């Protein structure tokens, strides 16, 4: 809470400089060689790391470290400005660490890609870094609300070749940005729509349903003549099925195609006339088709338009839609600022099993005076603090109990926060094929022998009794 308040105020007080002298922003960059013996506006810090058995790594309490992924340049005017204004977060980092000496990490994900964590430690050691703070599960949890996503893949003849491979990879990467609270189904349509996999209505994005969808997408072949009015009339109908369980909010449609001629006004006027379903249109591949109807489709219905001409753009274009989804919660005001705890997952910096509390940081530039609200509808980032499962285990002593006795905790989804059977290993998703990022989610019924009484007990604990 206090970190978010300070970050909001510091952003409110910032001035958008453009001319940066060679030494105006000072930071560590958390990825530089400690012994270079040697930039456009930045001056590096040579810090001192001694040791800390609480982390196992070598850390510095004097300042925070900044991680900037490989793709994003660190000399851009959009990155230098944040590297300047986020420098005020170090004082609050130190204050929190001195008030509670048991704090492990205090990360501030940013909408541009950089992450600032207080204990200055070098990043994880072809060793190329594909880490992006805007795709981690805690950031995704804290940047939007549970979704009802229905990916609509174009499988006509024209998407054959490179376009099909790019579409498959993009769909897989989009599926990777989904939590257990999110429900997703993947459909396809050349001339008549059909479900890509055995699922027919909607499935929650577990680690297994996602693999099923990914395999079914990778089995897709392209043949036929595009018919938008039969694919959208199918997507909107599977978004109306209420016999099954769903997140029941943020009903969004993903259209993966190349380009066309039909805008299908009748289908939208028939199904979505009050505009309760968002539409995101993707123009995948390198071609010269008419990218006109899909932009209008993403404009008339709430949504945004993306272009994926290569493998590099896949990650950013698939991750960007959270920025669009985040507008209602920031417009809600100081009511969406609720701390949410993620599922148990292996820490990126190798602390083992942890859970992160997430608080969104809103844009309050010109809040006092009602002048500017156009760009205030996008989040600045997500704050995050990590608590290790070792702390929760220490809060529950077991040596007064018999060895057969133990403690366990259940979240609403039914996964175990604490359990003796739970181990720091990724969940097995299937038989290993011949020739850490995923959350560790183990159900209560999958950690012990399933019994009739243990299901009723699980339901009662989920209800909160």
């Amino acid at each position: 809470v206090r970190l978010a308040l300070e970050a909001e105020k510091v952003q409110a007080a910032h001035q958008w400089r453009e001319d940066f002298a060679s030494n105006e922003v000072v930071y560590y960059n958390a990825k530089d060689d400690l012994d270079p013996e040697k930039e456009p506006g930045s001056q590096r810090i040579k810090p001192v790391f001694i040791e800390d058995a609480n982390f196992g790594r070598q850390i510095s309490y004097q300042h925070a470290a900044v991680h900037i992924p490989t793709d994003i340049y660190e000399g851009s005017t959009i990155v230098l400005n944040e590297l300047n204004w986020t420098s005020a977060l170090d004082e609050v980092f130190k204050k929190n660490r001195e008030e509670d000496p048991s704090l492990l990490w205090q990360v501030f994900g940013s909408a541009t890609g950089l992450a600032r964590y207080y204990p200055a430690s070098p990043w994880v050691d072809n060793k190329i870094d594909l880490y992006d703070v805007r795709r981690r599960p805690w950031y995704i949890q804290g940047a939007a609300s549970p979704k009802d996503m229905l990916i609509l893949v174009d499988v006509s003849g024209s998407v054959s070749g490179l376009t099909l491979k790019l579409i498959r990879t993009s769909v897989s990467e989009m599926l990777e940005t989904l939590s257990d609270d999110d429900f997703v189904n993947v459909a396809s349509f050349n001339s008549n729509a059909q479900d890509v996999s055995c699922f027919q209505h909607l499935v929650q994005a577990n680690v297994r349903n996602k693999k099923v969808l990914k395999d079914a997408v990778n089995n897709i072949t392209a043949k036929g003549i595009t018919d938008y009015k039969k694919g959208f009339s199918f997507a909107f109908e599977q978004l109306l099925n209420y016999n099954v369980s769903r997140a029941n909010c943020n009903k969004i449609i993903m259209l993966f195609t190349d380009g066309g001629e039909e805008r299908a006004q009748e289908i939208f006027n028939k199904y979505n006339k009050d505009k309760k379903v968002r539409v995101f249109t993707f123009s995948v591949g390198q071609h010269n088709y008419d990218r006109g109807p899909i932009q209008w489709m993403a404009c008339e219905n709430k949504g945004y338009y993306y272009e994926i001409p290569s493998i590099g753009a896949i990650r950013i274009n698939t991750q960007e839609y959270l920025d669009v989804l985040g507008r209602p919660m920031v417009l809600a005001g100081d009511k969406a600022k609720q701390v949410q705890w993620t599922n148990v997952y292996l820490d990126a910096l190798e602390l083992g099993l942890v859970i992160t509390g997430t608080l969104p940081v809103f844009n309050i530039t010109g809040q006092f005076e009602n002048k500017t609200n156009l760009k205030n509808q996008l989040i600045l980032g997500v704050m995050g603090v990590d608590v290790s499962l070792e702390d929760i285990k220490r809060l529950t002593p077991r040596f007064t109990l018999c060895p057969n006795g133990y403690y366990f905790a259940i979240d609403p989804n039914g996964y175990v926060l604490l359990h003796p059977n739970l181990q720091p290993k990724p969940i097995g998703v299937g038989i290993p094929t011949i020739n850490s990022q995923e959350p560790v989610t183990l159900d209560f019924l999958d950690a012990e022998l399933e019994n009739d009484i243990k299901v009723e007990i699980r339901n009662k604990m989920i209800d909160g009794e």
Binding site: Q295, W296, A298, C299, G303, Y304, Y305, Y306
Partner: peptide, 9 residues
């Protein structure tokens, strides 16, 4: 909803 993207590209 005026930032739809097509216009800004």
């Amino acid at each position: 909803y005026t930032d739809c993207g097509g216009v800004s590209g």
